[PDB]
Amino acid sequence: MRLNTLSPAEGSKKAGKRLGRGIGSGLGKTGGRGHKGQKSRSGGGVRRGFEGGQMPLYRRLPKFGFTSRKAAITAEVRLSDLAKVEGGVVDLNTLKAANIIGIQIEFAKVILAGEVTTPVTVRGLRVTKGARAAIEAAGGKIEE
Amino acid sequence: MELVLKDAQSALTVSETTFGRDFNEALVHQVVVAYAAGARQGTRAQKTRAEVTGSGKKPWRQKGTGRARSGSIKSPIWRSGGVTFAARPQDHSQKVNKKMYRGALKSILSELVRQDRLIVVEKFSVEAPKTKLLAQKLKDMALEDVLIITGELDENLFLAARNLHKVDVRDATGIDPVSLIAFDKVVMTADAVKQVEEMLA
Amino acid sequence: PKIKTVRGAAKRFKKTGKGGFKHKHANLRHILTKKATKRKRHLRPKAMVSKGDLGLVIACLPYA
Amino acid sequence: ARVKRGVIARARHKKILKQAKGYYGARSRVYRVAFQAVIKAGQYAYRDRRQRKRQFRQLWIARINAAARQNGISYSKFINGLKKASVEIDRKILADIAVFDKVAFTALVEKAKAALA
RNA sequence: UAGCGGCGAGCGAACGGGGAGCAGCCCAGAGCCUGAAUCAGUGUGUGUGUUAGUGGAAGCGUCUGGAAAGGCGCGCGAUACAGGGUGACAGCCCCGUACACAAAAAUGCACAUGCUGUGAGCUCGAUGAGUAGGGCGGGACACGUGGUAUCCUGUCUGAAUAUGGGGGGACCAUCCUCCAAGGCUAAAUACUCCUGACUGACCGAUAGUGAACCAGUACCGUGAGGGAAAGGCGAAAAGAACCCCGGCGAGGGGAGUGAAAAAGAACCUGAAACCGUGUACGUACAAGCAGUGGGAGCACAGACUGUGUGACUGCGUACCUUUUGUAUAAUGGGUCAGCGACUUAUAUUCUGUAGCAAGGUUAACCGAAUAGGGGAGCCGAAGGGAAACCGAGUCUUAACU
RNA sequence: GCUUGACUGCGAGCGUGACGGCGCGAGCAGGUGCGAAAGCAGGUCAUAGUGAUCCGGUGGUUCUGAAUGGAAGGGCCAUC
Ligand SMILES: [Mg+2]
Ligand SMILES: [Mg+2]
Ligand SMILES: [Mg+2]
Ligand SMILES: [Mg+2]
Ligand SMILES: [Mg+2]
Ligand SMILES: [Mg+2]
Ligand SMILES: [Mg+2]
Ligand SMILES: [Mg+2]
Ligand SMILES: [Mg+2]
Ligand SMILES: [Mg+2]
Ligand SMILES: [Mg+2]
Ligand SMILES: [Mg+2]
Ligand SMILES: [Mg+2]
Ligand SMILES: [Mg+2]
Ligand SMILES: [Mg+2]
Ligand SMILES: [Mg+2]
Ligand SMILES: [Mg+2]
Ligand SMILES: [Mg+2]
Ligand SMILES: [Mg+2]
Ligand SMILES: [Mg+2]
Ligand SMILES: [Mg+2]
Ligand SMILES: [Mg+2]
Ligand SMILES: [Mg+2]
Ligand SMILES: [Mg+2]
Ligand SMILES: [Mg+2]
Ligand SMILES: [Mg+2]
Ligand SMILES: [Mg+2]
Ligand SMILES: [Mg+2]
Ligand SMILES: [Mg+2]
Ligand SMILES: [Mg+2]
Ligand SMILES: [Mg+2]
Ligand SMILES: [Mg+2]
Ligand SMILES: [Mg+2]
Ligand SMILES: [Mg+2]
Ligand SMILES: [Mg+2]
Ligand SMILES: [Mg+2]
Ligand SMILES: [Mg+2]
Ligand SMILES: [Mg+2]
Ligand SMILES: [Mg+2]
Ligand SMILES: [Mg+2]
Ligand SMILES: [Mg+2]
Ligand SMILES: [Mg+2]
Ligand SMILES: [Mg+2]
Ligand SMILES: [Mg+2]
Ligand SMILES: [Mg+2]
Ligand SMILES: [Mg+2]
Ligand SMILES: [Mg+2]
Ligand SMILES: [Mg+2]
Ligand SMILES: [Mg+2]
């Protein structure tokens, strides 16, 4: 182990394409751009979703729906997150302190995802049917 | 893990994770390379055809003169024209994940112990701030190219070191993988080794 | 700098569980009375983007 | 990292020019021309290794025809007779024998004639 | 992202969070007590810079060499082995460097202090009207007039005034929050004509500034303006006394200097194109991409093979580009030398590889600084639906086989 | 002659398109018409009779509603 005995893993560093350095290189004269077109040109090419002029798919098809502002402030909790908090009470504030839900999160739901072993008291949160059953089995409590 | 000491011939227990792990060469190499990249300064710049000092007028008319068609005197294919892809000052600093860095350090430390390049001692203080004294001590310890890692900061030791280019005295907080690899031997004080273990975990 | 989204594409497409894109069918917007009810019914539900245009959609929506 | 390219460029040119020694005019003096000439020579050499094989066989056949006729038999007939007689002597050797050993060639011809009829 | 947008191309927040820095005041006014805090100028004293500077360690012998700083021996200094010179590469030869000191005078910044101006605290008040709103036309807000809140105003109007008024994205009610139409205010932020120090996986004379050189010069232009080329003898001029040819030339040959003048100022090296002198071989009956395969002779070098030439002979219409297709009478190149074109930054995806793994990782910033802190955030572990919402399901539908 | 199947929700599975799409479809649920009944009927013997998106208009709505309650605007469904 000297500064002239170390070496990278095989496959770590790969050879960097150098365009336009002669015939043997492979990427010879043209540099893998074929022969004179728009794409051949420096700066050449066409913007995203351009189809020669055809009405592009993102325009062909109709716009739909709207964005909900309450969805931005809802969140979804896991039973593994019911264990990740500290204590035995799961409020919004407690979850936030734990760092599980985001700060501007008015509402949260406990979903049956993962598993809860310790007894936990879910207070003031919506809980899905499977999650509620799981928590009860764990020996927990849910209250509004 | 257990390192016997030179001065007292007494053992010192350490973590197997820190001082007895495998040497992951690829990881170590990446970390050292990153260190070098970070150390570079990267201050340079050429002039693009934009920046080269001159007028932006057409040297001669597009057609007629029979000369090849020229547009600017600052062209990159002209003598005293711009550099085509002129450099700017750039930051060559690579990120290294904390865990990756720590692992690399662990591997290097382990390698040193295996290779018998890590020498542990109870204390490596010099009495005066005198290069002559430090040199004599090193000779007595048999050493020449060495990184003396100390726990607590020592003024006499640091000053004495200053003029020996083969010798380098560091605080245990300021160790770095390139330095460890570079220096022929590494002499850690007992406090320093303990501190390093605490740091690395 | 950050790549910008094609906002029209964002409006018209939404990503699914594996990484497809559902979209609303064309032709159910105006003159309807001539269109047959069966056709209208079929057009009503959403539809996955085909294999051909998936790439184009992906280019349009880099943060989708 | 300004890689000046004088030394390499000149070495490369010099190698090509050296290869093009002995060519008339700019084909031995002026790089562009010399290089063109060198490439051409290479192409010719490849062709002519093949053509060399062809030519020498042609020469051997001509010599053997002359010798066989001197011994009163055409080349084709002589070759057929030899083939019949199971003589595997190849025609480089046959030509050499004809040139330098008339008795041996005559003996061979006799064998061919006997085998033929 | 939400939004804006021929809903195209594109533009693009805020709320909220983490940091840097954090300083609050005064007038619309008078009574009291009143030189009371603060701020500014101005003298004086102290401290610390700045504008000259001082000291600053320790090596000789031998070999090669023009010369030692190199080789080989044996020593010494080092809070000084940064750096630069000196006849080749020097810790100890010189200048410095670490470190310790220094200002008659002028002056920056601190306090301390004197003088001048400056006015603190209490009670009672007062609380910015052609203004806020509005109509018309524009503009600014991410916001293009749209359902468009908010800000500015060219034009025409025009309130209430704390029992009051503004905002909370058309608008109304409730609730919350603030007080416009008067001002001042350090820090964290931006930049470098200029001054000093230091640094570079920056250039090294076609590069780096246009300019290493008497360069914004020569030169060009009426003018605004454009705008070059051009570095190197030697360690030291020791820069060639004297003689000779020559026009009391130029130029050269000796001589001398020097390590070297094929280092002589047209000066380090001194390539290529291009032009000569000499020698070997070939060539004046022979038709073309000028080579290549075969190949005689001749010359040379060694003891037959190497080299040089190439009579004669088979085959053989350059290169690039562009094209269905070029010897093409299609393009480009007089040649040489130097330079001349897939880069960089940031986002995103896939592949390899390393780390950790249901977790991974930090950004600004802080930091005896590539350590460590910082988890604000971001991606992932759950999807369905336009959405409310539901959730290993969900949407469709009255319900789904 | 009697009628409104010129139904509503869906739809195994196929055809045809680079795609946008276009076409055929037994069967299931609801509710109907003719037939004594078996049955047939989701327009016409079939193949032309047509126009994406955007931007709006009209009606409905158990979605949304920028402090809160509404509303505007947006969405969804039908349609121009
Ligand atoms: Mg290739
Ligand atoms: Mg190829
Ligand atoms: Mg390509
Ligand atoms: Mg081309
Ligand atoms: Mg073409
Ligand atoms: Mg092309
Ligand atoms: Mg361009
Ligand atoms: Mg958080
Ligand atoms: Mg002009
Ligand atoms: Mg330049
Ligand atoms: Mg860090
Ligand atoms: Mg509609
Ligand atoms: Mg001095
Ligand atoms: Mg000194
Ligand atoms: Mg010496
Ligand atoms: Mg020299
Ligand atoms: Mg006021
Ligand atoms: Mg107004
Ligand atoms: Mg208004
Ligand atoms: Mg207002
Ligand atoms: Mg509101
Ligand atoms: Mg040069
Ligand atoms: Mg220049
Ligand atoms: Mg110049
Ligand atoms: Mg005269
Ligand atoms: Mg003279
Ligand atoms: Mg010389
Ligand atoms: Mg010279
Ligand atoms: Mg020459
Ligand atoms: Mg002749
Ligand atoms: Mg001729
Ligand atoms: Mg020969
Ligand atoms: Mg020939
Ligand atoms: Mg072609
Ligand atoms: Mg043609
Ligand atoms: Mg041809
Ligand atoms: Mg031509
Ligand atoms: Mg060409
Ligand atoms: Mg030409
Ligand atoms: Mg990439
Ligand atoms: Mg990867
Ligand atoms: Mg009936
Ligand atoms: Mg018909
Ligand atoms: Mg449109
Ligand atoms: Mg419009
Ligand atoms: Mg409507
Ligand atoms: Mg509501
Ligand atoms: Mg509301
Ligand atoms: Mg509504």
From the CA of C3 to the C1' of E246: give the distance in Å.
85
Residue B119 backbone phi and psi in degrees, to 5: -110, 120
**Closest chain C residue by Cα to residue A64:** C12
Q: Is C1 on the interface with A (CB under 8 A)?
A: no
Helices D75-85, D31-70: inter-axial angle, 10-degree rounding: 80
Q: How far is CA A9 from the centre of its chain?
A: 29
Q: Is C15 on the interface with A (CB under 8 A)?
A: no
Q: How far is A50 from chain B (nearest CA, A)?
A: 30
Residues in chain A closer than 8 A to B112 (CB atoms): 1
**Touch between chain C and chain A (3+ CB pairs, < 8 Å)?**
yes
Tell me how far apart the alpha carbons of residues B160 and B29 are, in angstroms, rounded to a whole number.
Answer: 32
**Touch between chain C and chain B (3+ CB pairs, < 8 Å)?**
no
Tell me how far apart the alpha carbons of residues A33 and B38 are, in angstroms, rounded to a whole number.
Answer: 36
CB contact under 8 A, A59 and C8: yes
For tokens 């007992």, the residue is B190
Indicate the residue of C6, C24, C28 with minimum beta-carbon distance to A58.
Answer: C6
Segments forming the whole domain that contains residue D91: 1-117
**Residue A109 β-bridge partners:** A76, A126
**Touch between chain B and chain A (3+ CB pairs, < 8 Å)?**
yes
Provide CB contacts within 8 A for A143, sequence distance 6+. Answer: A121, A122, A123, A124
Q: Which of D13, D26, D98 is nearest to D62 (CA)?
A: D98
List all chains that touch chain A, counting a touch as 3 or more CB pairs closer than 8 Å. B, C
What CATH architecture applies to the domain B2-200? 3-Layer(aba) Sandwich (3.40)
CB contact under 8 A, A8 and B178: no
Indicate the residue of A3, A9, A12 with minimum beta-carbon distance to B181.
Answer: A3
Q: Is C57 on the interface with A (CB under 8 A)?
A: yes
CB contact under 8 A, C13 and A58: yes
Domain A74-142 has CATH 3.30.1360.20: no
Q: How many CA atoms lie within 13 A of D18 on its CB side?
A: 6
Q: How many domains does chain C contain in total?
A: 1
Q: How far is B24 from chain A (nearest CA, A)?
A: 10
For residue D37, what are the CA distances in angstroms to A30, B180, D5, D14, D43?
25, 59, 25, 14, 10
Q: How far is CA B69 from the centre of its chain?
A: 52
Tokens representing residue B94 in the block = 């690579």
- For residue B167, the surrounding DSSP H or E stretch is strand B167-171
Tell me how far apart the alpha carbons of residues C17 and C12 are, in angstroms, rounded to a whole number.
Answer: 17
Strand E within 7 A of D45 CB: yes
Tell me how far apart the alpha carbons of residues D41 and B194 are, in angstroms, rounded to a whole number.
Answer: 75
Q: How many CA atoms lie within 13 A of C32 on its CB side?
A: 10
Is residue B156 within 8 Å of B129, Cβ to Cβ? yes
Interchain CB contacts (distance < 8 Å): A and B: 25
**Residue A123 β-bridge partners:** A143
Tell me how far apart the alpha carbons of residues A129 and A144 are, in angstroms, rounded to a whole number.
Answer: 15
Residues in chain B closer than 8 A to A1 (CB atoms): 23, 28, 108, 111-112, 115, 181
Strand F footprint, Cβ within 7 Å: A 51, 54-55, 57, 59-66, 68-70; C 23-45, 47, 49-50, 52-53
CB contact under 8 A, A3 and B182: yes
Tokens representing residue A51 in the block = 């189809």
Is residue A78 within 8 Å of A113, Cβ to Cβ? yes
Q: How far is B178 from chain A (nearest CA, A)?
A: 8
Tell me how far apart the alpha carbons of residues B93 and A97 are, in angstroms, rounded to a whole number.
Answer: 34
Residue B26 backbone phi and psi in degrees, to 5: -55, -45
CB contact under 8 A, C28 and A49: no
Tokens representing residue B16 in the block = 């197997």
The DSSP code for A86 is S
Segments forming the whole domain that contains residue C10: 1-64
Q: How many domains does chain D contain in total?
A: 1
| Helix ranges restricted to H, C1-64 | 7-12, 37-43, 51-60
Residue type, B140: D
Probe site for chain C from A61, A67, A68 (most C CB atoms < 10 A): A61
CB contact under 8 A, B32 and A7: no
From the CA of B145 to the C1' of E79: give the distance in Å.
21
**Closest chain C residue by Cα to residue A60:** C26
CB contact under 8 A, B28 and A1: yes
Q: Which of B46, B55, B57 is nearest to B84 (CA)?
A: B46
Strand E within 7 A of B83 CB: yes
**Residue C15 β-bridge partners:** C21
Secondary structure E strands in B57-113: none
Residues in chain B closer than 8 A to A6 (CB atoms): 25, 28-29, 32, 181
Residue A112 backbone phi and psi in degrees, to 5: -70, 85
Locate the domains of chain B by residue range: 2-200
For tokens 């500290």, the residue is A86
Helices B98-115, B25-39: inter-axial angle, 10-degree rounding: 110
CB contact under 8 A, A9 and B26: yes
